[PDB]
Design an enzyme around this catalytic site. Structure first.
Site, PDB file in Angstrom:
ATOM      1  N   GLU A  35       0.845  -1.316   0.060  1.00 53.06           N
ATOM      2  CA  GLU A  35      -0.071   0.015   0.265  1.00 53.06           C
ATOM      3  C   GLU A  35       0.892   1.327   0.042  1.00 53.06           C
ATOM      4  O   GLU A  35       0.488   2.297  -0.740  1.00 53.06           O
ATOM      5  CB  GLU A  35      -0.962  -0.232   0.981  1.00 53.06           C
ATOM      6  CG  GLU A  35      -2.104  -0.957   1.121  1.00 53.06           C
ATOM      7  CD  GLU A  35      -3.197  -0.760   0.339  1.00 53.06           C
ATOM      8  OE1 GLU A  35      -3.228   0.728  -0.190  1.00 53.06           O
ATOM      9  OE2 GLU A  35      -4.153  -1.117  -0.265  1.00 53.06           O
ATOM     10  N   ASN A  46      -7.716   9.971  -5.953  1.00 54.47           N
ATOM     11  CA  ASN A  46      -8.556   9.317  -6.655  1.00 54.47           C
ATOM     12  C   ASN A  46      -9.357  10.165  -7.737  1.00 54.47           C
ATOM     13  O   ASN A  46     -10.461  10.896  -7.203  1.00 54.47           O
ATOM     14  CB  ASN A  46      -9.477   8.275  -5.960  1.00 54.47           C
ATOM     15  CG  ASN A  46     -10.390   7.529  -6.987  1.00 54.47           C
ATOM     16  OD1 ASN A  46     -10.696   7.718  -8.187  1.00 54.47           O
ATOM     17  ND2 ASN A  46     -10.724   6.229  -6.677  1.00 54.47           N
ATOM     18  N   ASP A  49     -13.613   9.313  -7.874  1.00 52.22           N
ATOM     19  CA  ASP A  49     -14.525   9.574  -7.002  1.00 52.22           C
ATOM     20  C   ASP A  49     -14.073  10.896  -6.133  1.00 52.22           C
ATOM     21  O   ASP A  49     -14.885  11.034  -5.014  1.00 52.22           O
ATOM     22  CB  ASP A  49     -14.813   8.307  -6.034  1.00 52.22           C
ATOM     23  CG  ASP A  49     -13.676   7.865  -5.198  1.00 52.22           C
ATOM     24  OD1 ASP A  49     -12.705   8.562  -5.072  1.00 52.22           O
ATOM     25  OD2 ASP A  49     -13.776   6.877  -4.553  1.00 52.22           O
ATOM     26  N   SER A  51     -11.662  11.115  -3.834  1.00 56.24           N
ATOM     27  CA  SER A  51     -11.287  11.015  -2.725  1.00 56.24           C
ATOM     28  C   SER A  51      -9.874  10.749  -2.605  1.00 56.24           C
ATOM     29  O   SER A  51      -9.094  10.435  -3.598  1.00 56.24           O
ATOM     30  CB  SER A  51     -11.917   9.905  -1.855  1.00 56.24           C
ATOM     31  OG  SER A  51     -11.560   8.728  -2.499  1.00 56.24           O
ATOM     32  N   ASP A  53      -6.318   8.911  -0.468  1.00 50.36           N
ATOM     33  CA  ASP A  53      -5.758   7.769   0.596  1.00 50.36           C
ATOM     34  C   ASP A  53      -4.645   8.170   1.332  1.00 50.36           C
ATOM     35  O   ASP A  53      -3.734   8.871   0.551  1.00 50.36           O
ATOM     36  CB  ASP A  53      -5.454   6.452  -0.333  1.00 50.36           C
ATOM     37  CG  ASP A  53      -6.579   5.635  -0.396  1.00 50.36           C
ATOM     38  OD1 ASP A  53      -7.732   5.686  -0.024  1.00 50.36           O
ATOM     39  OD2 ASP A  53      -6.341   4.380  -0.730  1.00 50.36           O
ATOM     40  N   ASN A  60      -8.664   5.700   3.319  1.00 48.20           N
ATOM     41  CA  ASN A  60      -9.321   6.727   2.647  1.00 48.20           C
ATOM     42  C   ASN A  60     -10.250   7.679   3.179  1.00 48.20           C
ATOM     43  O   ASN A  60     -10.768   7.512   4.354  1.00 48.20           O
ATOM     44  CB  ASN A  60     -10.473   6.036   1.706  1.00 48.20           C
ATOM     45  CG  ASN A  60     -11.165   6.622   0.495  1.00 48.20           C
ATOM     46  OD1 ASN A  60     -12.100   6.780   0.571  1.00 48.20           O
ATOM     47  ND2 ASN A  60     -10.577   7.312  -0.445  1.00 48.20           N
TER      48      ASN A  60
HETATM   49  C1  LIG Z   1     -11.167   1.615  -0.179  1.00 44.05           C
HETATM   50  O1  LIG Z   1     -12.199   2.350  -0.793  1.00 44.05           O
HETATM   51  C2  LIG Z   1     -13.480   1.466  -0.598  1.00 44.05           C
HETATM   52  C3  LIG Z   1     -14.381   2.047  -1.661  1.00 44.05           C
HETATM   53  O2  LIG Z   1     -13.949   2.597  -2.673  1.00 44.05           O
HETATM   54  C4  LIG Z   1     -13.827   1.329   0.827  1.00 44.05           C
HETATM   55  O3  LIG Z   1     -15.154   0.270   0.842  1.00 44.05           O
HETATM   56  C5  LIG Z   1     -16.104   1.022   1.262  1.00 44.05           C
HETATM   57  O4  LIG Z   1     -15.882   0.783   2.723  1.00 44.05           O
HETATM   58  C6  LIG Z   1     -17.314   1.261   3.456  1.00 44.05           C
HETATM   59  C7  LIG Z   1     -17.059   1.308   4.818  1.00 44.05           C
HETATM   60  O5  LIG Z   1     -16.651   0.021   5.372  1.00 44.05           O
HETATM   61  C8  LIG Z   1     -18.592   0.564   2.911  1.00 44.05           C
HETATM   62  O6  LIG Z   1     -19.586   0.705   3.468  1.00 44.05           O
HETATM   63  C9  LIG Z   1     -18.568   0.342   1.494  1.00 44.05           C
HETATM   64  O7  LIG Z   1     -19.435  -0.517   1.048  1.00 44.05           O
HETATM   65  C10 LIG Z   1     -17.161  -0.118   0.644  1.00 44.05           C
HETATM   66  N1  LIG Z   1     -17.198   0.018  -0.768  1.00 44.05           N
HETATM   67  C11 LIG Z   1     -16.801  -0.911  -1.526  1.00 44.05           C
HETATM   68  C12 LIG Z   1     -16.892  -0.683  -2.918  1.00 44.05           C
HETATM   69  O8  LIG Z   1     -16.018  -1.929  -0.968  1.00 44.05           O
HETATM   70  C13 LIG Z   1     -12.624   0.918   1.591  1.00 44.05           C
HETATM   71  O9  LIG Z   1     -13.055   1.051   2.921  1.00 44.05           O
HETATM   72  C14 LIG Z   1     -11.344   1.699   1.412  1.00 44.05           C
HETATM   73  N2  LIG Z   1     -10.286   1.130   2.052  1.00 44.05           N
HETATM   74  C15 LIG Z   1      -9.529   1.865   2.816  1.00 44.05           C
HETATM   75  C16 LIG Z   1      -8.555   1.297   3.564  1.00 44.05           C
HETATM   76  O10 LIG Z   1      -9.696   3.099   3.121  1.00 44.05           O
END
Ligand SMILES: *[C@@H]1O[C@H](CO)[C@@H](O[C@@H]2O[C@H](CO)[C@@H](O)[C@H](O)[C@H]2NC(C)=O)[C@H](O)[C@H]1NC(C)=O
Length: 130
Positions: A35, A46, A49, A51, A53, A60
């Protein structure tokens, strides 16, 4: 700060990461490696969207920390994204623990899914004394 491999392993162990929710220290090391390359100042935007990291675990800004410029942010870790850019990783670890508590767990990290899952990761901690 770009951590040395064993330096980070010892640091995460001291912070309670070994076996947290069943996740081994070697797995946490594998994901930090891919990572961010163990770099606390790592940031990736990104354009899609809109956002960003942040830090060593690449947390994120839409769901976990607040940077103020991300549309529809939630701030589940109740942290300012800047706290995830410090040399001290305590806040990063606390937030990382919060992430794995959500439904998808460690599958939240794209890098773990692509480079660590179903793979032998012992090489990340061998020789560190942990
Ligand atoms: C990376 O990004 C994804 C989405 O782009 C994040 O996943 C979401 O996490 C939330 C909170 O748990 C969920 O409600 C969503 O359903 C998830 N979306 C998807 C598409 O999986 C993820 O948490 C992010 N990772 C980090 C480490 O920030």
């Amino acid at each position: 700060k770009v951590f040395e491999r064993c330096e980070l392993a010892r640091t995460l162990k001291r912070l309670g990461m070994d076996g947290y929710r069943g996740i081994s220290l070697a797995n946490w090391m594998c994901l930090a490696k891919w990572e961010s390359g163990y770099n606390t100042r790592a940031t990736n935007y990104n354009a899609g969207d809109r956002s960003t990291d942040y830090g060593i675990f690449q947390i994120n800004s839409r769901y976990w920390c607040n940077d103020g410029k991300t549309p529809g942010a939630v701030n589940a870790c109740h942290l300012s994204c800047s706290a995830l850019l410090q040399d001290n990783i305590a806040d990063a670890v606390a937030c990382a623990k919060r992430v794995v508590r959500d439904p998808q767990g460690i599958r939240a990290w794209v890098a773990w899914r692509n480079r660590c899952q179903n793979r032998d990761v012992r090489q990340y901690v061998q020789g560190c004394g942990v």
